[PDB]
Ligand binder design. Sequence first.
Ligand code: A1EGL
Ligand code: CL
Ligand code: CL
Length: 391
Amino acid sequence: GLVPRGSHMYASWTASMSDATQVLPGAAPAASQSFNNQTVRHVLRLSLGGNTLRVKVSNLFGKSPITFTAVRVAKSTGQSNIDVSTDKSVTFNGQASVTLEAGTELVSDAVNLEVAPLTNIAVSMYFSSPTAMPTVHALGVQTAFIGAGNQTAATSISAAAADQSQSYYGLTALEVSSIQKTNVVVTFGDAITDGYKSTVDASKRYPNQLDDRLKTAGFSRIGVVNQGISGNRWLNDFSGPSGTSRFDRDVLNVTGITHAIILLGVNDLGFSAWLAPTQTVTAEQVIAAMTTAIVKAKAKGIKVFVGTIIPFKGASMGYYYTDAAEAKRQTINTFIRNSKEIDGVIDFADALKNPADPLTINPIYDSGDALHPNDAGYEAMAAAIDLSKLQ
Ligand SMILES: CC(=O)O[C@H](C[C@@H](O)C[C@@H](C[C@H](O)C[C@H](O)C[C@H](O)C[C@H](O)CCO)OC(C)=O)C[C@@H](O)C[C@@H](O)C[C@H](C)O
Ligand SMILES: [Cl-]
Ligand SMILES: [Cl-]
C-alpha cells in the first residue's frame, strides 16, 4: 500500500574527526591548518537520496570557538564546479553564520534540496576571521578547493592549484530525509576502511564499492557511511581518537544506524615495534575492547559484523609487522571466527590473502606496501560481503 508518510533523517555521508595537533608520545608538536577570509569547497558522495538534507559541522577538537560565516550546499558538476541553480543557504536556527564552542558539533536546519543516491554534492564554508581548524578528517581521498573571500555560492573556486587539500575541515556528516524504510551500514575501521591507496576522487574506497553492489542489486535504501580513520587504533589515541573512545560518537550515534561492520586492530599490533614502543598491547587487550564495543552495539539493536584482520606480512618488516604482531593477529582472528556474540564474521582475510602464502596479501590486491589494498583489493573486500547480512 501507500508507504506511511512520516519523514526521517538518515546519515548519507560521514567522516570521522581527528585532532590534527595530536601526536605520538615524544613527538614534536604539530600545527593545525588555519583559514583567514577564505572559502573551502568540499565534495562528497551521497549514499542515500531523499527530499531534504542537513549538514553537521564540527569544532570537536578546537582549542577555541570557530565561526562558520557561511555554509552552502549545491550539486557538484566535477572538480570545484557546482550547478548554481541548486545552490542553497545552510542555516543554523535560521542564521547563516554560526559559532561552535571548542569541543562541540552542530547539525544544521533542513535544506530543501532533492538529491539522488550515489551523486556528489559540494559543501562550501566561508571563514571570515582567522580560524584554526584542528578538527579534520585527515585522509579524505578527495580533493577540496580553497580560495579567497566568500566564494561559497560561486560556480567554481578561483585559486591556485597548490591551495587544494585532500582533507575535510570541520565537516562530519550529511543527513538526508526520506519516508522509505532505510538501512544505514556504518563501516568502522582504520586506513583500510578509510580507503588509503584507493584512487583520489574516484569513490573506490571499499565502502563505496559495497554501496555500488547494493544499488546495483536494487537496494537504493540501504546506505553505507564511512567511519574509518587512517592510522586508527582500538586502544590508544593517534591516529585519531582511540577506537574505544570514539565508538559511541562514530558508530552508536550515527543517525539511523542499523548495521555496523568493524575492521580494526592492525595498527594496535603494528605501532609498537617502532612508532610507539611504550604502547605495546596484547591480543587479549584488543579482544576486550572489541567485546565492550560489541556489547554496546547489540544493546542498541544494531546488527554487528566483525571483519578478520587482513594479512600484512611484508609491511615494514621489523618496524611494523613482526612475529609478535602476527601471533596477535591470529589470536584475534580466531576469536572473531569463533565468537557467538557477533551477528556474523566478514572474512576479509580469507578474501584478500595470497593463495601462495596466507600470511601475505594477494599480490593482485597489494597497493605496493603489503598493508593497504589497491582499488581491486577494495573491490574484492566489497565483493566478499553477503548482502543478505545488510537487510
Ligand atoms: C592500516 C593503516 O591504518 O595504515 C597507515 C599507517 C601505516 O602506514 C604505518 C606504516 C609503517 C611505518 O611507515 C613504518 C616506519 O616507516 C618504519 C621506519 O621507517 C623504520 C625506520 O626508518 C628505521 C630507521 O633505522 O605502515 C607501513 C607503511 O608498513 C595509516 C596512515 O598513517 C596512512 C597515512 O599516514 C597516509 C597519509 C598520506 O600520511
Ligand atoms: Cl560475509
Ligand atoms: Cl551477496
